Amino acid sequence: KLRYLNILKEKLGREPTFVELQAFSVMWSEHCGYSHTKKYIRRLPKTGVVNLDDYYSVAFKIESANHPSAIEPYNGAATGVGGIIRDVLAMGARPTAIFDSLHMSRIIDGIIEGIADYGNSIGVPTVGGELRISSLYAHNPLVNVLAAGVVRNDMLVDSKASRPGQVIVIFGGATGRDGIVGDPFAEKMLIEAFLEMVEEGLVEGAQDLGAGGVLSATSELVAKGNLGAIVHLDRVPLREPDMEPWEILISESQERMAVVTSPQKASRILEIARKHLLFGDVVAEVIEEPVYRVMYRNDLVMEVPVQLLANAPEEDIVEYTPGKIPEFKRVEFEEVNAREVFEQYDHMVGTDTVVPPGFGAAVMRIKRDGGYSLVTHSRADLALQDTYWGTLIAVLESVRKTLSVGAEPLAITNCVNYGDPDVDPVGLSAMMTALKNACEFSGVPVASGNASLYNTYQGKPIPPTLVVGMLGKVNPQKVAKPKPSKVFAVGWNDFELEREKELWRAIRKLSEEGAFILSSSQLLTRTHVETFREYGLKIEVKLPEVRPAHQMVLVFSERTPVVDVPVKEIGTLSR
Ligand SMILES: Nc1ncnc2c1ncn2[C@@H]1O[C@H](COP(=O)(O)OP(=O)(O)CP(=O)(O)O)[C@@H](O)[C@H]1O
Ligand SMILES: [Mg+2]
Ligand SMILES: [Mg+2]
């Protein structure tokens, strides 16, 4: 913030006001700023609402609740959920499935329950997830939450102001002195509320309220529209009435959404909200002038170029060149049979999928012959040994899982979980390049993502962990389910980037022929066995010895697979 303060000062041509420093403290903070990752992200291929069938689109995104969680496992995680759901809800999509990618040194119930309760409380199933246990995350639990929803392409909500005159409504829970705990009940009302507003063609644009609260929502909603905004802090319904404009402006009270609309629609927006027991008012006004004038009645609180707020100081970036794929070695993440713990908290117990998520990619259908896959994958264990390849391979194995389910990879929502970038700007680059190159190799673009840097315990950084939330397309009727069959190991014990595509081609043919397929580092895990039992199936196999980063999958079929990849009957699935 030292360099920044200067910069902010040079840009202000003067000395920052309390509110100014207060505001830019948020907007430029790495969390809302992305100073170390912005340029790395602009480099990634893109497209977070991915179309699905020219009629439906799935809005999905991943988010981390790291620091919060490290403090308040329960609240942190839950808050991350709440927030990520709004990000999706704001896209005008009805949140249909939560996914989490937990990375901890142990089974921290707080996080599991926090995630679980919230989702249940708002009625959004916690379909799938991922759980990685490593002492290496002792003081830095990586709580990544991904959410997905469905949205008719003709109901897609623009995520920004796009016309002077439009006004921004802030509704949902009230604003109080928070971050300057939220309930799913208000969140659920928020979803029902916002969704109703969408259904009525009232929401012309929107943005959820999280980091930066009212400041980030408004400044961004318009900044994204290359417009301005006159924000009236006094119009924000508060919980604590004595709050100061700056408190009202940067407050991060939860369960709050900003709705861009036409003055004429604001009324219903408020009616719809209120009848849903939420509070809201027309807080801002989208103006053509690119200024961000925060007001509290006729009191000018703050006025700055919206764009200055929007664009934080961008750190340079170093080009990273990757070397020979390492001969990865044992970096054990003691797998926990924490299936009893999830049961106790009703977590990831989402039985409403085309096929149990415990088999890899969670499949959801939006129609009889239509549906989408979703997977959250990461290879921290590998990324620890080599940031690039590990990170890259994590993307490739996600493509496998997606393929293994018969789903064609559509997009990637991803979360960068890194330590201090100023110290190790390399790992950050390696991580981003791997992803960049990974998307380029796979051809799968990046729809959106989250970045969490400075994850370190007294010097030590958390393992470079890029969680990959991969969206895939799939016809449910064409999704293979477990059945007594022969189990074959298909692929290789080791990894050679290039031949990855021949493995995919293979997964594709087999999957196409209806074969069942698992793509796991362990080939088969307790969950896989667990889940098979749910089908009343016994998995007896001579699991091939495999490398950490390998290119082998488990194919279950009657007939022996016939592909251009090593095939070996390794056992059977029966009874
Ligand atoms: N690794 C990544 N890849 C692609 N896009 C990324 C990214 N990291 C961040 N982004 C994008 O940059 C912006 C910020 O992501 P972030 O998750 O912090 O958003 P947010 O506005 O929802 C704030 P909050 O945490 O308060 O909910 C988004 O528009 C997101 O799509
Ligand atoms: Mg932000
Ligand atoms: Mg947000």
Coordinates of C-alpha atoms and ligand atoms in Angstrom, one line a residue:
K1 CA 0.0 0.0 0.0
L2 CA 3.1 2.2 0.3
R3 CA 3.7 2.4 -3.5
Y4 CA -0.1 2.5 -3.9
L5 CA -0.8 5.4 -1.5
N6 CA 1.8 7.3 -3.6
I7 CA 0.1 6.3 -6.8
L8 CA -3.3 7.1 -5.4
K9 CA -1.9 10.4 -4.3
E10 CA -0.3 11.2 -7.7
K11 CA -3.6 10.4 -9.3
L12 CA -5.5 12.5 -6.8
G13 CA -3.1 15.3 -7.4
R14 CA -3.5 15.8 -3.7
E15 CA -3.7 14.1 -0.2
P16 CA -6.3 11.4 0.1
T17 CA -9.3 11.9 2.4
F18 CA -10.2 9.6 5.2
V19 CA -13.0 8.0 3.0
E20 CA -10.7 8.0 0.0
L21 CA -8.0 6.0 1.8
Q22 CA -10.7 4.0 3.4
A23 CA -12.2 3.2 -0.1
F24 CA -9.0 2.7 -2.0
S25 CA -7.9 0.5 0.9
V26 CA -10.6 -1.9 -0.3
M27 CA -10.6 -1.4 -4.1
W28 CA -6.8 -1.7 -4.4
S29 CA -6.4 -4.3 -1.7
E30 CA -5.2 -7.4 -3.4
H31 CA -8.6 -9.1 -2.8
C32 CA -10.6 -6.5 -4.8
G33 CA -7.6 -5.2 -6.8
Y34 CA -5.7 -8.3 -8.2
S35 CA -2.6 -6.3 -8.6
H36 CA -0.4 -9.4 -8.9
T37 CA -2.8 -11.5 -11.0
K38 CA -4.6 -9.0 -13.2
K39 CA -2.1 -9.1 -16.0
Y40 CA -1.7 -12.9 -15.6
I41 CA -5.5 -13.2 -15.9
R42 CA -5.8 -10.9 -19.0
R43 CA -3.4 -13.4 -20.6
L44 CA -5.7 -16.4 -20.0
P45 CA -8.2 -17.5 -22.7
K46 CA -11.8 -16.6 -21.8
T47 CA -15.5 -16.6 -22.7
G48 CA -18.8 -16.5 -15.8
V49 CA -21.8 -17.7 -17.9
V50 CA -21.1 -20.4 -20.4
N51 CA -23.9 -21.2 -22.8
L52 CA -25.1 -24.8 -22.8
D53 CA -27.7 -25.4 -25.5
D54 CA -28.4 -22.1 -27.1
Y55 CA -31.3 -21.8 -24.7
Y56 CA -29.7 -22.5 -21.3
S57 CA -26.5 -21.2 -19.9
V58 CA -24.8 -22.3 -16.7
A59 CA -23.5 -19.5 -14.5
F60 CA -20.8 -20.8 -12.2
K61 CA -17.8 -19.5 -10.3
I62 CA -15.3 -20.5 -7.6
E63 CA -14.2 -18.5 -4.6
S64 CA -12.0 -18.9 -1.6
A65 CA -12.8 -18.1 2.0
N66 CA -9.2 -18.7 3.1
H67 CA -8.3 -15.9 5.6
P68 CA -11.8 -15.7 6.9
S69 CA -11.9 -19.4 7.5
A70 CA -8.4 -19.6 9.1
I71 CA -10.0 -17.4 11.7
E72 CA -13.6 -18.6 11.7
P73 CA -13.8 -22.0 9.9
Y74 CA -17.5 -22.1 10.3
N75 CA -18.4 -18.5 9.5
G76 CA -15.6 -18.0 7.0
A77 CA -16.6 -21.0 4.9
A78 CA -20.3 -20.2 5.2
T79 CA -19.7 -16.6 4.3
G80 CA -17.7 -17.8 1.3
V81 CA -20.7 -19.9 0.3
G82 CA -23.2 -17.1 0.7
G83 CA -21.0 -14.8 -1.3
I84 CA -20.3 -17.2 -4.1
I85 CA -24.0 -18.0 -4.4
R86 CA -24.7 -14.3 -4.8
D87 CA -22.1 -14.0 -7.5
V88 CA -24.0 -16.7 -9.4
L89 CA -27.4 -15.4 -8.4
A90 CA -26.4 -12.0 -9.7
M91 CA -25.7 -13.5 -13.0
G92 CA -29.5 -14.0 -13.0
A93 CA -29.0 -17.7 -12.7
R94 CA -31.0 -19.7 -10.1
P95 CA -28.2 -21.3 -7.9
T96 CA -28.6 -25.0 -8.5
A97 CA -25.4 -26.5 -7.0
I98 CA -22.6 -25.7 -4.5
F99 CA -19.2 -27.4 -4.8
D100 CA -16.3 -27.0 -2.4
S101 CA -12.6 -27.6 -2.6
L102 CA -11.3 -27.9 0.9
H103 CA -7.6 -28.0 1.7
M104 CA -6.8 -28.5 5.3
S105 CA -4.3 -30.2 7.7
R106 CA -7.2 -32.1 9.2
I107 CA -11.0 -32.5 9.0
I108 CA -12.0 -29.1 10.3
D109 CA -15.7 -29.7 11.0
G110 CA -16.2 -25.9 11.2
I111 CA -15.6 -25.5 7.5
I112 CA -17.6 -28.6 6.4
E113 CA -20.6 -27.7 8.5
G114 CA -20.3 -24.0 7.7
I115 CA -20.5 -24.8 4.0
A116 CA -23.1 -27.5 4.6
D117 CA -25.5 -25.6 6.9
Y118 CA -25.5 -22.5 4.7
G119 CA -26.3 -24.4 1.5
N120 CA -29.0 -26.4 3.1
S121 CA -30.4 -23.3 4.7
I122 CA -30.7 -21.6 1.3
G123 CA -31.9 -24.8 -0.3
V124 CA -28.9 -25.2 -2.6
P125 CA -27.6 -28.7 -2.7
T126 CA -24.0 -29.2 -2.0
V127 CA -23.5 -31.6 -4.9
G128 CA -19.8 -32.4 -5.1
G129 CA -16.5 -31.2 -3.9
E130 CA -12.9 -32.2 -3.2
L131 CA -11.0 -32.6 0.1
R132 CA -7.2 -32.5 0.4
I133 CA -5.5 -33.2 3.7
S134 CA -2.0 -31.9 4.3
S135 CA -0.2 -30.6 7.4
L136 CA 1.1 -28.0 4.9
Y137 CA -2.3 -26.3 5.3
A138 CA -2.2 -26.3 9.1
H139 CA -2.6 -22.5 9.5
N140 CA -3.9 -21.8 6.0
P141 CA -7.1 -23.8 5.3
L142 CA -8.0 -23.4 1.6
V143 CA -11.8 -23.1 1.6
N144 CA -12.7 -22.8 -2.1
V145 CA -16.4 -22.8 -2.9
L146 CA -17.9 -23.1 -6.4
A147 CA -21.5 -22.5 -7.2
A148 CA -23.5 -23.1 -10.4
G149 CA -26.9 -22.3 -11.6
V150 CA -29.0 -22.4 -14.7
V151 CA -30.2 -19.3 -16.6
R152 CA -32.2 -19.0 -19.8
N153 CA -30.0 -17.2 -22.3
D154 CA -32.8 -14.7 -22.7
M155 CA -32.8 -13.9 -19.0
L156 CA -29.0 -13.4 -18.7
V157 CA -28.5 -10.5 -16.4
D158 CA -25.8 -8.1 -17.5
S159 CA -23.4 -7.6 -14.6
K160 CA -23.0 -3.9 -15.1
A161 CA -24.6 -0.5 -15.5
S162 CA -25.0 0.3 -19.2
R163 CA -27.0 3.5 -19.5
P164 CA -27.1 6.9 -17.8
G165 CA -30.4 7.2 -16.0
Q166 CA -30.3 3.6 -14.8
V167 CA -30.3 3.5 -11.1
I168 CA -28.8 0.9 -8.7
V169 CA -30.9 -0.7 -6.0
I170 CA -29.2 -2.3 -3.0
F171 CA -31.4 -4.9 -1.4
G172 CA -31.4 -8.0 0.8
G173 CA -30.1 -7.9 4.3
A174 CA -29.6 -4.5 5.9
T175 CA -26.2 -2.8 6.1
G176 CA -24.4 -2.6 9.4
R177 CA -20.8 -2.3 10.7
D178 CA -19.5 -5.5 9.2
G179 CA -15.9 -6.0 8.1
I180 CA -15.4 -2.3 8.7
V181 CA -22.2 -13.4 10.3
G182 CA -25.0 -13.6 7.7
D183 CA -28.0 -15.9 7.6
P184 CA -29.0 -18.1 4.6
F185 CA -32.6 -17.2 5.4
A186 CA -32.1 -13.7 4.1
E187 CA -29.9 -15.2 1.4
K188 CA -32.7 -17.5 0.3
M189 CA -35.1 -14.6 0.4
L190 CA -32.5 -12.7 -1.7
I191 CA -32.4 -15.5 -4.3
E192 CA -36.2 -15.8 -4.4
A193 CA -36.4 -12.1 -4.5
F194 CA -33.8 -11.4 -7.1
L195 CA -34.9 -14.3 -9.2
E196 CA -38.5 -12.8 -9.2
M197 CA -37.1 -9.5 -10.3
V198 CA -35.3 -11.2 -13.2
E199 CA -38.4 -13.2 -14.2
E200 CA -40.2 -9.9 -14.4
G201 CA -37.5 -8.3 -16.6
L202 CA -36.7 -5.7 -14.0
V203 CA -33.0 -6.4 -13.5
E204 CA -31.1 -4.7 -16.3
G205 CA -27.8 -5.3 -14.5
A206 CA -26.6 -6.5 -11.1
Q207 CA -23.7 -7.3 -8.8
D208 CA -23.7 -9.0 -5.4
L209 CA -22.3 -7.3 -2.4
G210 CA -19.2 -8.9 -0.8
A211 CA -15.8 -7.3 -0.4
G212 CA -16.0 -3.6 -0.6
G213 CA -19.7 -3.8 0.1
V214 CA -21.7 -0.9 -1.4
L215 CA -18.5 0.7 -2.7
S216 CA -17.3 -2.1 -4.9
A217 CA -20.8 -3.0 -6.2
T218 CA -21.7 0.4 -7.4
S219 CA -18.2 1.6 -8.5
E220 CA -17.8 -1.6 -10.4
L221 CA -21.3 -1.9 -11.8
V222 CA -20.8 1.4 -13.5
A223 CA -17.0 1.3 -14.1
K224 CA -17.7 -1.9 -16.1
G225 CA -20.1 0.2 -18.1
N226 CA -17.6 3.0 -18.6
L227 CA -20.2 5.2 -16.9
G228 CA -20.3 7.0 -13.5
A229 CA -22.5 6.9 -10.4
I230 CA -24.0 9.2 -7.8
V231 CA -24.3 7.1 -4.7
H232 CA -26.5 8.2 -1.9
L233 CA -25.4 6.5 1.3
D234 CA -28.4 7.8 3.1
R235 CA -30.6 5.6 0.9
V236 CA -28.9 2.4 2.1
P237 CA -31.2 0.7 4.7
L238 CA -29.0 0.1 7.7
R239 CA -29.1 -2.1 10.8
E240 CA -26.9 0.2 12.8
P241 CA -28.5 3.7 12.1
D242 CA -25.6 5.7 13.5
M243 CA -23.1 4.4 10.9
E244 CA -20.9 6.9 9.1
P245 CA -20.9 7.4 5.3
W246 CA -17.6 5.6 5.0
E247 CA -19.0 2.8 7.2
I248 CA -22.1 2.6 5.0
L249 CA -19.9 2.8 1.9
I250 CA -17.3 0.0 2.6
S251 CA -19.5 -2.1 5.0
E252 CA -19.5 -5.7 4.0
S253 CA -22.8 -6.8 5.5
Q254 CA -23.9 -10.1 3.9
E255 CA -26.9 -11.2 1.8
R256 CA -27.0 -8.0 -0.2
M257 CA -27.4 -7.5 -4.0
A258 CA -27.1 -4.4 -6.2
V259 CA -29.7 -4.2 -9.0
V260 CA -29.2 -2.0 -12.0
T261 CA -32.5 -1.0 -13.5
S262 CA -34.5 1.8 -15.0
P263 CA -36.0 4.3 -12.5
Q264 CA -39.4 3.0 -13.5
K265 CA -38.7 -0.5 -12.5
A266 CA -37.1 0.3 -9.1
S267 CA -40.5 0.4 -7.4
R268 CA -41.4 -3.3 -8.1
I269 CA -37.7 -4.2 -7.4
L270 CA -38.3 -2.7 -3.9
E271 CA -41.8 -4.2 -3.6
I272 CA -40.5 -7.7 -4.6
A273 CA -37.7 -7.2 -2.1
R274 CA -39.8 -6.0 0.8
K275 CA -42.5 -8.6 0.4
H276 CA -39.6 -11.1 0.7
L277 CA -38.7 -9.4 4.0
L278 CA -35.5 -7.8 2.6
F279 CA -34.7 -4.1 2.8
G280 CA -33.6 -2.0 -0.2
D281 CA -33.7 1.4 -1.8
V282 CA -32.5 3.1 -4.9
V283 CA -29.1 4.0 -3.7
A284 CA -27.2 5.1 -6.7
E285 CA -27.8 6.6 -10.2
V286 CA -25.8 5.6 -13.2
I287 CA -24.5 8.8 -14.9
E288 CA -22.6 9.3 -18.1
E289 CA -19.8 11.2 -16.4
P290 CA -17.2 8.6 -15.2
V291 CA -17.1 9.9 -11.7
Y292 CA -17.9 8.1 -8.5
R293 CA -19.6 10.6 -6.3
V294 CA -20.6 9.1 -2.9
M295 CA -23.1 11.3 -1.2
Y296 CA -24.9 11.3 2.2
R297 CA -27.8 13.6 1.5
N298 CA -26.3 16.8 0.1
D299 CA -23.0 16.0 1.9
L300 CA -20.3 15.2 -0.6
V301 CA -18.7 12.2 1.0
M302 CA -16.3 11.3 -1.7
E303 CA -15.8 12.0 -5.3
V304 CA -13.2 10.3 -7.5
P305 CA -12.9 8.9 -11.0
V306 CA -14.9 5.7 -11.0
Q307 CA -12.2 4.2 -13.2
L308 CA -9.4 5.1 -10.7
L309 CA -11.3 3.1 -8.1
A310 CA -11.8 0.3 -10.7
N311 CA -8.2 0.0 -11.9
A312 CA -5.8 -0.7 -9.1
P313 CA -2.0 -0.5 -9.6
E314 CA -0.9 -3.5 -11.6
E315 CA 2.3 -5.3 -10.7
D316 CA 4.6 -6.3 -13.5
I317 CA 4.6 -9.9 -14.5
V318 CA 7.5 -12.3 -15.4
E319 CA 7.3 -14.6 -18.3
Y320 CA 7.7 -18.2 -17.0
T321 CA 9.3 -21.0 -19.0
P322 CA 8.6 -24.6 -17.7
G323 CA 11.1 -27.4 -17.8
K324 CA 11.0 -31.2 -18.1
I325 CA 8.1 -32.7 -16.3
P326 CA 9.5 -33.7 -12.9
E327 CA 9.7 -37.3 -11.8
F328 CA 7.2 -36.5 -9.1
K329 CA 7.5 -38.3 -5.8
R330 CA 5.6 -39.1 -2.7
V331 CA 4.2 -35.9 -1.2
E332 CA 1.5 -37.7 0.8
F333 CA -1.8 -35.9 1.6
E334 CA -3.2 -38.4 4.1
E335 CA -6.6 -39.3 2.6
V336 CA -9.3 -39.3 5.2
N337 CA -12.3 -41.5 5.2
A338 CA -14.3 -38.4 6.3
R339 CA -17.5 -39.7 4.7
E340 CA -19.0 -40.1 8.2
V341 CA -18.2 -36.5 9.0
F342 CA -20.0 -35.2 5.9
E343 CA -23.0 -37.4 6.8
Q344 CA -23.0 -35.9 10.3
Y345 CA -23.2 -32.4 8.8
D346 CA -25.3 -33.3 5.7
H347 CA -22.5 -32.3 3.3
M348 CA -21.8 -33.2 -0.3
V349 CA -24.6 -35.7 0.3
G350 CA -26.3 -34.4 -2.8
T351 CA -28.0 -37.4 -4.3
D352 CA -29.7 -35.3 -7.0
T353 CA -27.2 -35.8 -9.8
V354 CA -27.3 -37.9 -13.0
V355 CA -24.7 -39.9 -11.2
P356 CA -23.2 -39.7 -7.7
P357 CA -20.5 -37.1 -7.6
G358 CA -18.3 -39.4 -5.6
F359 CA -17.2 -40.9 -8.9
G360 CA -15.5 -37.7 -10.0
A361 CA -17.4 -35.1 -12.0
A362 CA -20.8 -34.3 -10.6
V363 CA -23.5 -34.4 -13.3
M364 CA -26.6 -32.3 -13.3
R365 CA -29.3 -32.2 -15.8
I366 CA -31.2 -29.1 -16.9
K367 CA -33.4 -31.1 -19.2
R368 CA -34.0 -34.8 -20.0
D369 CA -31.4 -34.9 -22.8
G370 CA -29.5 -31.9 -21.5
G371 CA -27.2 -31.4 -18.6
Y372 CA -23.8 -30.3 -17.4
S373 CA -20.8 -31.7 -15.5
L374 CA -18.9 -30.0 -12.8
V375 CA -15.7 -30.9 -11.2
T376 CA -13.4 -29.2 -8.7
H377 CA -9.8 -30.5 -9.0
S378 CA -6.3 -29.5 -7.9
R379 CA -2.9 -31.2 -7.6
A380 CA -1.3 -29.2 -4.8
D381 CA 0.8 -32.3 -4.0
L382 CA 2.4 -32.0 -7.5
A383 CA 2.4 -28.2 -7.6
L384 CA 4.5 -28.2 -4.5
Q385 CA 7.1 -30.2 -6.5
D386 CA 6.7 -28.0 -9.6
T387 CA 4.2 -25.2 -9.6
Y388 CA 3.8 -25.2 -13.4
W389 CA 3.3 -28.8 -14.3
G390 CA 1.4 -29.6 -11.1
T391 CA -0.9 -26.7 -11.8
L392 CA -1.1 -27.7 -15.5
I393 CA -1.7 -31.4 -14.8
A394 CA -4.5 -30.4 -12.4
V395 CA -6.2 -28.8 -15.4
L396 CA -5.6 -31.9 -17.6
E397 CA -7.0 -34.3 -15.0
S398 CA -10.1 -32.2 -14.7
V399 CA -10.5 -32.6 -18.5
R400 CA -10.2 -36.4 -17.9
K401 CA -12.8 -36.4 -15.2
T402 CA -15.1 -34.3 -17.4
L403 CA -14.4 -36.7 -20.3
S404 CA -14.7 -39.8 -18.1
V405 CA -18.3 -38.8 -17.5
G406 CA -19.1 -38.3 -21.1
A407 CA -19.1 -34.6 -20.7
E408 CA -17.3 -32.3 -23.2
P409 CA -15.3 -29.7 -21.3
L410 CA -16.9 -26.3 -21.7
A411 CA -15.1 -23.9 -19.4
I412 CA -13.0 -23.3 -16.3
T413 CA -13.7 -21.3 -13.2
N414 CA -10.5 -21.3 -11.2
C415 CA -9.1 -20.2 -7.9
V416 CA -5.4 -19.3 -7.4
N417 CA -4.3 -20.0 -3.9
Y418 CA -0.8 -18.6 -3.5
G419 CA 1.5 -17.4 -0.7
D420 CA 3.3 -14.1 -0.9
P421 CA 3.8 -13.0 -4.6
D422 CA 6.2 -10.2 -3.7
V423 CA 8.5 -12.9 -2.3
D424 CA 7.9 -15.6 -4.9
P425 CA 6.6 -13.8 -8.0
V426 CA 7.8 -16.9 -9.9
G427 CA 5.4 -19.5 -8.5
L428 CA 2.6 -17.1 -9.2
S429 CA 3.7 -16.8 -12.8
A430 CA 4.4 -20.6 -13.1
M431 CA 0.9 -21.2 -11.7
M432 CA -0.8 -18.7 -14.1
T433 CA 1.2 -19.9 -17.1
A434 CA 0.5 -23.5 -16.5
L435 CA -3.2 -22.7 -16.4
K436 CA -2.8 -20.4 -19.4
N437 CA -0.9 -23.1 -21.4
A438 CA -3.2 -25.8 -19.9
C439 CA -6.3 -24.1 -21.3
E440 CA -4.4 -23.5 -24.6
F441 CA -3.4 -27.2 -24.8
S442 CA -6.8 -28.5 -23.8
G443 CA -8.7 -25.8 -25.7
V444 CA -10.9 -25.3 -22.7
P445 CA -11.2 -21.6 -21.9
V446 CA -11.5 -19.8 -18.6
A447 CA -15.0 -18.5 -17.8
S448 CA -14.0 -16.8 -14.5
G449 CA -12.1 -17.5 -11.4
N450 CA -10.9 -16.3 -8.0
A451 CA -7.5 -15.3 -6.7
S452 CA -6.2 -15.7 -3.1
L453 CA -2.6 -14.6 -2.5
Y454 CA -0.5 -14.1 0.7
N455 CA -1.5 -17.4 2.2
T456 CA 1.4 -18.0 4.5
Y457 CA 2.1 -19.0 8.1
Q458 CA 5.0 -17.0 9.5
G459 CA 7.0 -16.9 6.3
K460 CA 6.0 -20.3 4.9
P461 CA 3.6 -20.2 1.9
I462 CA 0.8 -22.7 1.3
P463 CA 1.5 -25.1 -1.5
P464 CA 0.7 -23.4 -4.8
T465 CA -2.9 -24.6 -5.1
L466 CA -4.9 -23.8 -8.2
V467 CA -8.3 -25.3 -7.8
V468 CA -9.9 -26.0 -11.2
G469 CA -13.7 -25.9 -11.3
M470 CA -14.3 -27.3 -14.8
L471 CA -17.7 -27.0 -16.5
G472 CA -18.6 -29.7 -19.0
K473 CA -21.6 -30.4 -21.3
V474 CA -23.4 -33.8 -21.3
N475 CA -26.6 -35.5 -22.3
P476 CA -27.7 -37.3 -19.1
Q477 CA -29.3 -40.1 -21.1
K478 CA -25.8 -40.7 -22.3
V479 CA -24.2 -40.8 -18.8
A480 CA -22.9 -44.2 -17.9
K481 CA -23.9 -45.7 -14.5
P482 CA -22.1 -48.5 -12.6
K483 CA -23.1 -52.0 -13.4
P484 CA -21.5 -55.4 -13.0
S485 CA -18.6 -55.1 -15.5
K486 CA -14.9 -55.8 -16.0
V487 CA -12.5 -53.2 -14.7
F488 CA -9.7 -52.2 -16.9
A489 CA -6.8 -49.9 -16.2
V490 CA -6.4 -47.7 -19.3
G491 CA -3.5 -45.3 -19.9
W492 CA -0.1 -45.1 -18.4
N493 CA 1.6 -45.2 -15.0
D494 CA 3.6 -42.0 -15.9
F495 CA 2.8 -38.7 -17.6
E496 CA 3.9 -37.2 -21.0
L497 CA 1.9 -34.1 -21.6
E498 CA 1.4 -34.6 -25.3
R499 CA -0.1 -38.1 -25.2
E500 CA -2.7 -36.7 -22.8
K501 CA -4.9 -36.0 -25.8
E502 CA -4.7 -39.7 -27.0
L503 CA -5.9 -40.6 -23.5
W504 CA -8.8 -38.2 -23.9
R505 CA -9.6 -39.5 -27.4
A506 CA -9.7 -42.9 -25.7
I507 CA -11.9 -41.8 -22.8
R508 CA -14.2 -40.3 -25.4
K509 CA -14.6 -43.5 -27.5
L510 CA -15.1 -45.7 -24.4
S511 CA -17.4 -43.2 -22.8
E512 CA -19.2 -43.0 -26.1
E513 CA -19.7 -46.8 -26.1
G514 CA -21.3 -46.3 -22.7
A515 CA -18.3 -47.6 -20.6
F516 CA -18.2 -46.4 -17.0
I517 CA -15.0 -44.5 -16.2
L518 CA -13.1 -43.2 -13.1
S519 CA -10.2 -40.8 -13.3
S520 CA -8.4 -40.6 -10.0
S521 CA -4.8 -40.1 -8.9
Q522 CA -5.4 -43.2 -6.8
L523 CA -7.2 -44.8 -9.7
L524 CA -9.7 -45.9 -7.1
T525 CA -10.4 -44.4 -3.7
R526 CA -12.4 -45.4 -0.7
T527 CA -15.2 -43.1 -1.9
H528 CA -15.2 -44.9 -5.3
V529 CA -15.6 -48.2 -3.3
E530 CA -18.1 -46.5 -0.9
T531 CA -20.2 -45.2 -3.8
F532 CA -20.1 -48.5 -5.6
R533 CA -21.6 -50.1 -2.5
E534 CA -24.4 -47.7 -2.9
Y535 CA -25.0 -49.5 -6.2
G536 CA -24.5 -52.8 -4.4
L537 CA -21.3 -53.4 -6.2
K538 CA -18.0 -55.0 -5.2
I539 CA -14.8 -53.6 -6.8
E540 CA -12.1 -56.2 -6.8
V541 CA -9.0 -55.1 -8.7
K542 CA -5.3 -55.5 -9.0
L543 CA -4.7 -51.7 -9.2
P544 CA -1.6 -51.1 -11.2
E545 CA 1.3 -49.4 -9.4
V546 CA 1.0 -45.8 -10.5
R547 CA 3.0 -42.5 -10.5
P548 CA 1.8 -39.4 -8.7
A549 CA 1.1 -37.7 -12.1
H550 CA 0.0 -40.6 -14.3
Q551 CA -2.1 -40.9 -17.4
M552 CA -4.3 -43.9 -16.5
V553 CA -8.0 -44.2 -15.9
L554 CA -10.2 -47.1 -14.7
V555 CA -12.7 -48.3 -17.3
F556 CA -15.6 -50.5 -16.4
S557 CA -17.3 -52.4 -19.2
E558 CA -18.4 -55.9 -20.2
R559 CA -16.3 -56.0 -23.4
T560 CA -12.6 -55.3 -23.2
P561 CA -11.9 -51.7 -24.2
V562 CA -10.6 -51.2 -27.7
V563 CA -8.6 -48.0 -27.8
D564 CA -5.2 -46.7 -28.9
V565 CA -4.1 -46.6 -25.3
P566 CA -2.7 -49.3 -23.0
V567 CA -5.6 -51.5 -21.8
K568 CA -5.3 -54.0 -19.0
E569 CA -8.2 -56.0 -17.4
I570 CA -7.3 -55.4 -13.7
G571 CA -10.3 -56.9 -11.9
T572 CA -14.1 -56.7 -11.8
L573 CA -17.1 -54.8 -10.5
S574 CA -20.0 -57.1 -9.7
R575 CA -22.9 -58.3 -7.5
Ligands
LIG1 N1 -7.9 -16.7 -11.7 C1 -8.9 -16.0 -12.3 N2 -9.3 -16.4 -13.6 C2 -10.2 -15.7 -14.3 N3 -10.9 -14.6 -13.8 C3 -10.5 -14.2 -12.5 C4 -9.6 -14.9 -11.7 N4 -9.4 -14.3 -10.5 C5 -10.3 -13.3 -10.6 N5 -11.0 -13.2 -11.7 C6 -12.1 -12.3 -12.2 O1 -11.9 -11.0 -11.6 C7 -13.0 -10.5 -10.9 C8 -13.0 -10.9 -9.4 O2 -13.1 -12.2 -8.7 P1 -13.5 -12.2 -7.2 O3 -13.8 -13.6 -6.9 O4 -12.7 -11.5 -6.2 O5 -14.9 -11.4 -7.3 P2 -16.1 -10.7 -6.4 O6 -16.4 -9.4 -7.2 O7 -17.2 -11.6 -6.5 C9 -15.7 -10.1 -4.9 P3 -16.2 -11.0 -3.5 O8 -15.1 -11.9 -3.0 O9 -16.5 -9.9 -2.6 O10 -17.4 -11.9 -3.8 C10 -14.2 -11.3 -11.4 O11 -14.9 -10.6 -12.3 C11 -13.5 -12.7 -11.8 O12 -14.3 -13.3 -12.9
MG2 MG -13.7 -8.0 -5.0
MG3 MG -19.0 -10.0 -5.3

